Ligand binder design. Structure first.
Ligand code: CL
Ligand code: CL
Length: 162
C-alpha cells in the first residue's frame, strides 16, 4: 500500500462531474473543481484544468494525471507549511500517508487548524491523538474514512485498508 492506493480507496474514481460529500462539483479521484453552485462554472474549471473541451467528461488517464498533481501539491503544501512540516518530519512512513490523506481532503489550512492533535502526533502519543482527532466535524461528517485515517495514525500499519 502507498499514498496513491490509499487515496484511490477513500475517494474512488468518477469520470463524470459529480458532487462530493459537501455538495461540491468534483471529478476523477477527489479533484475539487469549484465550490460554486454552478455546473457551468464547474465545466469551465474542468476544461481549464485539462486543456481541452471536455464537456463534463474525462478519461482515466486524465483523472490519473490530475491525481498525480494533486498528491504532489498536497506533499509540497505540507513541506511549505510551518505548522505541518515539523509534524510530517517527525513521522514514520505509514503515518506520513495518514497526514497527506487529511491534507488532500481538507486542505493545508484545515489540517493546520488541528493544533492539539498535531502536538500529540508529534509527541507520538498515539492513542491520545486518535481520541482528539475524533472530536471534529471531519469525523462526524465522514466517519468511515476518518476512522480509517485515525487507525492508521494509532497503529502505524495499513490494517484499516486491508
Ligand atoms: Cl466534537
Ligand atoms: Cl465516510
Amino acid at each position: 500500500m502507498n499514498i496513491f492506493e490509499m487515496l484511490r480507496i477513500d475517494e474512488g474514481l468518477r469520470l463524470k462531474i459529480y458532487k462530493d460529500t459537501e455538495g461540491y462539483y468534483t471529478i476523477g479521484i477527489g479533484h475539487l473543481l469549484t465550490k460554486s453552485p454552478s455546473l457551468n462554472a464547474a465545466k469551465s474549471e474542468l476544461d481549464k484544468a485539462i486543456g481541452r473541451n471536455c464537456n463534463g467528461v474525462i478519461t482515466k488517464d486524465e483523472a490519473e494525471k490530475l491525481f498525480n498533481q494533486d498528491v504532489d501539491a498536497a506533499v509540497r503544501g505540507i513541506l511549505r507549511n510551518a505548522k505541518l512540516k515539523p509534524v510530517y518530519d517527525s513521522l514514520d512512513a505509514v503515518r506520513r500517508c495518514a497526514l497527506i490523506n487529511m491534507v488532500f481532503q481538507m486542505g493545508e489550512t484545515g489540517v493546520a487548524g488541528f493544533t492539539n492533535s498535531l502536538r500529540m502526533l508529534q509527541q507520538k502519543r498515539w492513542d491520545e491523538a486518535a481520541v482528539n482527532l475524533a472530536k471534529s466535524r471531519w469525523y462526524n461528517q465522514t466517519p468511515n474514512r476518518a476512522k480509517r485515517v485515525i487507525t492508521t495514525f494509532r497503529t502505524g500499519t495499513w490494517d484499516a485498508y486491508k
